[PDB]
Design an enzyme around this catalytic site. Structure first.
Site, short mmCIF file in Angstrom:
data_model
loop_
_atom_site.label_atom_id
_atom_site.label_comp_id
_atom_site.label_asym_id
_atom_site.label_seq_id
_atom_site.Cartn_x
_atom_site.Cartn_y
_atom_site.Cartn_z
N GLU C 103 0.97 -1.14 0.13
CA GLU C 103 0.31 -0.71 -0.43
C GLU C 103 0.60 1.56 -0.37
O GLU C 103 0.97 2.08 -0.61
CB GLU C 103 -0.58 -0.17 0.96
CG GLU C 103 -1.12 -1.80 1.66
CD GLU C 103 -2.41 -1.21 0.03
OE1 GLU C 103 -3.19 -1.09 -0.54
OE2 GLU C 103 -2.79 -2.51 0.30
N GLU C 133 -3.95 4.53 -1.24
CA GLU C 133 -3.06 4.11 -1.26
C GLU C 133 -2.60 4.66 -0.01
O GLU C 133 -2.20 4.02 1.02
CB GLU C 133 -2.48 3.62 -2.45
CG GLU C 133 -2.63 3.15 -3.81
CD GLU C 133 -2.69 2.17 -3.69
OE1 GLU C 133 -3.17 1.18 -2.42
OE2 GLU C 133 -2.77 1.43 -4.72
N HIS C 136 -4.94 2.72 2.52
CA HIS C 136 -4.98 1.32 3.08
C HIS C 136 -3.59 1.64 3.18
O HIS C 136 -3.39 0.06 4.43
CB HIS C 136 -4.43 0.87 0.96
CG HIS C 136 -6.05 0.47 0.23
ND1 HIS C 136 -5.83 1.03 -0.71
CD2 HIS C 136 -7.19 0.96 0.27
CE1 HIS C 136 -7.21 0.27 -1.47
NE2 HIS C 136 -7.83 1.18 -0.65
N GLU C 198 -2.70 -5.31 -8.96
CA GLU C 198 -4.33 -5.36 -8.83
C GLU C 198 -5.64 -5.32 -9.32
O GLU C 198 -5.76 -6.62 -8.71
CB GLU C 198 -3.94 -3.66 -8.40
CG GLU C 198 -3.91 -2.84 -7.61
CD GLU C 198 -3.49 -1.41 -7.74
OE1 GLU C 198 -3.36 -0.99 -9.10
OE2 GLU C 198 -2.91 -0.27 -7.09
N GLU C 232 -10.34 -0.97 -4.20
CA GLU C 232 -8.44 -1.68 -5.37
C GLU C 232 -9.96 -1.77 -6.91
O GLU C 232 -9.10 -1.80 -7.61
CB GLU C 232 -8.53 -2.50 -4.99
CG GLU C 232 -7.76 -2.13 -3.66
CD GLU C 232 -6.19 -1.52 -3.99
OE1 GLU C 232 -5.90 -1.91 -5.43
OE2 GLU C 232 -5.86 -0.62 -3.41
N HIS C 235 -8.59 0.95 -8.86
CA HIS C 235 -7.25 0.98 -9.05
C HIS C 235 -7.23 -0.36 -10.64
O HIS C 235 -6.32 0.66 -11.25
CB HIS C 235 -6.39 0.62 -8.46
CG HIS C 235 -6.63 1.48 -7.23
ND1 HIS C 235 -5.83 1.19 -5.87
CD2 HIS C 235 -7.67 2.47 -7.05
CE1 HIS C 235 -5.91 2.03 -5.15
NE2 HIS C 235 -6.91 2.51 -5.35
FE LIG Z 1 -4.27 -0.70 -1.83
FE LIG Z 2 -4.41 -0.70 -5.43
#
Ligand SMILES: [Fe+3]
Ligand SMILES: [Fe+3]
Lengths: 387, 168, 515
Positions: C103, C133, C136, C198, C232, C235
């Site tokens: 992260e 991030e 996270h 990801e 996510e 992402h």
């Molecule tokens: Fe993440």
């Molecule tokens: Fe990510």
């Protein structure tokens, strides 16, 4: 339904028998070994500090060895080559607001939701009816609009900072500072879109504002500075310092606070102060963190303070001249506004500039030992005020 | 033989002894360049201090950078390498070198050497970083062309390894 | 005028602002990325989610409130922090902190991509990921912070940001989740982080982590990572738009599938065995063999569906995908060997598979019992768990010719004489230094790119030093200063101290000295 060890009888019994009847250590403070900045270690420091996996050859790191994978040619994942400044511990920095992700989005979420309730009510109120039409259409729509491009350019200067910078708390300060800047730009456009719903024929397109930002003499100095701070350098301390401590604290403060916010309360504008309230709140939050990084951590580093002040003074000399010239260009906008004694006349602009430069001397210059003659700077800018 | 502790050992200590004796920018520049040529990159002359050179490098950097701010006029911090060369001239020299490189083996050694010679504090950070990025762009374009074209057997002979063991 | 105005209640919704975002960027000669790259992201690239700063914050703040309610109110009232099976409670010290560095580095990787993009919408997509991030990073931190407060063994939950530096398992994590995310062409980092880390691995990671955690009584980790999953998804859309943004650059056809193949091998080389090991060996109750989870998500869903749709922009399936599938069956069992053998260098308490675990392993990985099972049983018999034994299995491996090597590229440990996974030892001398490589793909990376791969390994750092001295130096002890954080069992008594380690006399060799 899937079986869960918390509620399933067999598994809960097996787990209960396996769990020892006493703690295997009494140290329950997550990352207890972080040196606290304040009286007690904070949740902000626990969650943030030493997340960055620096080795011992980047000041303050706890790890060892080379990185596992580097750039073609050998540039390290993070390296001392990323900035001219030096310190005994890159992890020292602390945001005085103590913002990890959760409080940061919690606060901006309050502003997000409250803003839309405000707007729904302001349109219901009809309060736009009393705005000075010339201000609304010729100054606010065009030149406040064009100002979003300063905020936007300042936002993007942070992209290499977010990649390059050397510690976790610093990274958090820079990323939040970046989001707050693109927020300012998006809020300026939100205001224009909002007015376009209340005033027929009011054009909220960015065409004219961008034309002004990219070609109008009033903004050519600011645009040149923003372009240099963003794409001209990569020293991430230089970007942060030039961006927030010099350019945004002089030009950006004068434009936002002394021009658009102040003069809105001279021309009957009950709307724009709602938006500049947010940009100026974000400015002071950002300033606290910038101040800690550059004053507390770097200008006063026990071993490299004089070293770092050499570079900070050289940057300030350079970027202050850029910002003074930005303001010289900008105060040509006063020739376009209706005269208001004490606000838009030369005396009024003089006092506005004395506040900006006077505050800057206290907030930034004196803390790094940068000599500045406030009257000289005021007079330099005032040379652009039309007669 | 036996390694000393990671962060405090006699090798780091001995090199800090040498670094303390540096009293001028020219002297410190020669020191850090000889150091990076002798102990950094896969083309270093010696692995004798492999587990200490990166920290030692940091300390040389800190000494030269302080000598720069104490000894040099502020303009030189912005425009010159501590070799006395103009920083934009170094950038021009090395960008041109790598653009005339004829193989990936040529280009990699130009890029590595540029870093051994001019890594900050020798070159100003802003000039250095944009030169490193320009060199890296060229090195990657040539390395990543037909990347799987040479078999491992051939890549080993090109790199010049001595193969000591191949399993199975 | 001053008397008549439309007074209907109106606001400005996020997408009304967002439609003007692309026009916030302007043209100047120097408006160009600062990072080295073979590619150019197109000026008109759009993004999928029309989010502005205020809407981002509102979105995420609402997720936080649910999550923190569950953790700090409900789960605390239940005492759930100490209703986790110890095997799993220990495994989360490693799982959460190792994922945390992924992260964290993804903040910097996303900023680098923000710098590479020229379209304002594409910069904005990467920016939203930059913020996520950070969220996270602090969520992973919060898992170990919460365990530190409520679980029966806080050591190692409470200091991994320094105790991870002791051991070899952390080195491999730094390659896939730290350095692999931020060091290279931004496009290479994008395929590492977004297209693979990801779009390929984050779904099986989250499904498995939350399913294995809840199976073992852990309701803290599902509360966090099911919230992480919602971010996510966006992402993966960034990874998609990176490939779109460069699709019409001719450099894409020359280079993109080389960067993707390298990135996929990079990620799978460690992510496959380390998660498989942490799941199946750090658990009491078993969910589904890791291999099946890998096959469904990596091989079928990503290698099939995702890669297939990406053919519209020139993406091919990675050439190393076959080799990675054979690894997915045995490579985590191989890794378990090294992880149990070098347990004192970790920061978690380990449990050898019991008879039920061994039946499970043999039933789902037929061949496990005669090989790994025999080895683990021999170690138990020799005093693996007993602090009076003077027995640490790394020394047994050396005594029996089962040398441990470290891939110079991936940092993954390799035991050729016992490995059932893919791979094979190559040992080269170059310019007075010996290097061990362990597979065709990484060896190519090292031969072409020797200066990218100079990482010192644990045998080089610790050569000829005694194990207990290394642990003490690295702070690998509990608050009493003598009892190890790491342990070879999960019981409350007979915990090993520095003195019990010293009794074994484990001294690190140079594994390449013989070549
Ligand atoms: Fe993440
Ligand atoms: Fe990510």
């Amino acid at each position: 339904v899937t079986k869960r060890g918390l509620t399933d009888p067999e598994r809960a019994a097996i787990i209960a028998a396996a769990v020892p009847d006493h703690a295997l250590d009494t140290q329950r403070k997550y990352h207890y070994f972080i040196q606290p900045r304040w009286k007690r270690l904070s949740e902000y420091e626990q969650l943030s500090c030493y997340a960055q996996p620096n080795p011992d050859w980047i000041a303050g790191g706890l790890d060892w060895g080379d990185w596992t994978q580097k750039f073609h040619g050998g540039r390290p994942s993070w390296g001392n080559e990323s900035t001219e400044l030096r310190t005994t511990d890159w992890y020292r920095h602390r945001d005085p607001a103590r913002r990890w992700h959760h409080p940061y989005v919690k606060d901006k979420s309050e502003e997000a939701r409250y803003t839309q309730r405000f707007l729904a009510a302001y349109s219901s109120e009809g309060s736009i009816r009393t705005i000075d039409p010339y201000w609304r259409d010729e100054i606010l729509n065009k030149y406040f609009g064009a100002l979003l491009y300063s905020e936007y350019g300042l936002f993007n200067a942070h992209s290499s900072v977010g990649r390059d910078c050397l510690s976790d708390t610093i990274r958090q300060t820079a990323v939040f500072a970046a989001l707050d800047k693109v927020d300012n730009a998006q809020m300026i456009q939100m205001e224009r879109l909002f007015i376009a719903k209340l005033v027929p024929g009011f054009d909220a397109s960015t065409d004219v504002p961008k034309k002004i930002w990219t070609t109008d003499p009033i903004y050519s100095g600011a645009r040149a500075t923003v372009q240099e701070i963003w794409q001209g350098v990569q020293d991430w301390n230089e970007i942060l310092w030039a961006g927030h401590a010099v350019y945004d604290a002089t030009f950006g403060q004068f434009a936002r606070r002394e021009f658009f916010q102040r003069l809105a309360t001279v021309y009957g504008d009950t709307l724009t102060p709602f938006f500049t309230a947010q940009s100026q709140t974000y400015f002071q939050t950002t300033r606290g963190a910038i101040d800690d990084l550059f004053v507390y951590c770097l200008a006063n580093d026990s071993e490299f303070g004089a070293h770092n002040r050499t570079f900070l003074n050289a940057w300030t000399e350079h970027y202050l001249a850029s910002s003074v010239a930005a303001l010289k260009d900008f105060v040509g906008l006063y020739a376009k506004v209706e005269k208001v004694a004490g606000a838009t006349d030369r005396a009024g602009v003089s006092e506005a500039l004395q506040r900006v430069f006077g505050d800057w001397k206290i907030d930034y210059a004196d803390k790094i030992g940068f000599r500045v003659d406030v009257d000289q700077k005021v007079d330099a800018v005032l040379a652009g005020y039309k007669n | 033989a036996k390694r000393e502790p990671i962060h405090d050992n006699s090798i780091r200590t001995e090199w800090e002894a040498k670094i303390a004796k540096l009293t001028s920018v020219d002297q410190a520049t020669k020191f850090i360049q000889d150091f990076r040529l002798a102990y950094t990159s896969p083309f270093r002359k010696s692995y004798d201090i492999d587990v200490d050179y990166q920290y030692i490098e940091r300390k040389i950097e800190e000494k030269l950078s302080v000598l720069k701010t104490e000894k040099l006029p502020v303009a030189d911090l912005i425009t010159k390498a501590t070799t006395g060369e103009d920083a934009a001239a170094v950038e021009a020299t090395w960008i041109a070198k790598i653009k005339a490189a004829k193989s990936k083996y040529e280009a990699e050694r130009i890029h590595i050497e540029f870093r051994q010679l001019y890594k900050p504090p020798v070159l100003p950070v802003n000039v250095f970083l944009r030169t490193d990025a320009a060199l890296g762009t060229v090195l990657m374009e040539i390395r990543n062309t037909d990347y799987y074209g040479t078999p491992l057997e051939g890549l080993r002979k090109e790199r010049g390894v001595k193969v000591l063991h191949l399993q199975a | 005028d001053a008397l008549k105005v439309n007074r209907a209640p109106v606001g400005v919704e996020p997408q009304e602002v967002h439609k003007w975002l692309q026009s916030f960027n302007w043209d100047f000669k120097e408006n160009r990325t600062k990072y080295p790259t073979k590619y150019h992201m197109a000026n008109e690239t759009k993004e999928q989610f029309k989010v502005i700063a205020k809407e981002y914050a509102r979105m995420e703040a609402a997720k936080d409130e649910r999550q923190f309610g569950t953790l700090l109110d409900g789960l605390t009232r239940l005492g759930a922090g100490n209703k986790v099976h110890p095997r799993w409670g220990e495994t989360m010290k490693v799982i959460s902190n190792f994922l945390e560095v992924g992260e964290y580095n993804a903040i910097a990787a996303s900023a680098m991509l923000w710098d590479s993009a020229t379209a304002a919408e594409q910069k904005n997509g990467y920016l939203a990921q930059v913020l996520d991030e950070i969220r996270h990073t602090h969520q992973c931190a919060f898992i170990n912070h919460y365990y530190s407060k409520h679980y029966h063994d806080p050591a190692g939950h409470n200091d991994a940001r320094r105790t991870r530096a002791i051991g070899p398992l952390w080195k491999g994590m730094k390659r896939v989740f730290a350095d692999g995310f931020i060091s290279g062409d931004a496009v290479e980092c994008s395929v590492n982080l977004q297209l693979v880390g990801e779009a390929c691995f984050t779904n099986p990671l989250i499904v498995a982590v939350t399913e294995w955690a809840s199976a073992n009584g852990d309701e803290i980790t599902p509360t966090v990572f099911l919230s992480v999953e919602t971010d996510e998804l966006r992402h993966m859309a960034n990874g998609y738009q990176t490939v779109v943004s460069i699709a019409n650059d001719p450099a894409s056809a020359k280079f993109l599938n080389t960067d993707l193949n390298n990135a996929f091998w990079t990620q799978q080389k460690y992510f496959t065995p380390v998660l498989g090991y942490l799941f199946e060996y750090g658990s009491k109750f078993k969910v589904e063999p890791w291999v099946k989870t890998w096959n469904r998500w990596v091989y079928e869903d990503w290698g099939g569906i995702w890669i297939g749709r990406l053919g519209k922009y020139g993406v091919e399936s990675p050439a190393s995908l076959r080799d990675a599938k054979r690894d997915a069956y045995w490579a985590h069992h191989d890794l378990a060997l090294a992880a149990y053998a070098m347990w004192p260098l970790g920061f978690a308490r380990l449990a050898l598979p019991d008879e039920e675990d061994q039946a499970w392993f043999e039933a789902n990985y037929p061949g496990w019992a005669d090989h790994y099972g025999k080895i683990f049983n021999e170690w138990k018999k020799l005093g693996y768990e007993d602090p009076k034994s003077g027995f640490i299995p790394y020394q047994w491996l050396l005594a029996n010719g089962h040398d441990v090597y470290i891939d110079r590229v991936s940092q993954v440990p390799f035991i050729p004489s016992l490995a059932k996974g893919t791979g094979s030892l190559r040992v080269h001398e170059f310019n007075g230094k010996k290097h061990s490589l362990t597979d065709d793909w990484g060896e190519r990376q090292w031969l072409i790119e020797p200066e990218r791969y100079e990482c010192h390994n644990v045998f080089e750092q610790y050569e000829g030093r005694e194990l207990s001295e290394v642990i003490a130096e690295g702070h690998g002890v509990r608050s009493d200063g003598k009892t190890l954080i790491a342990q070879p069992h999960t019981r409350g008594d007979n915990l090993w101290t520095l003195e019990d380690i010293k009794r074994a006399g484990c001294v690190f060799p140079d594994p390449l000295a013989k070549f």
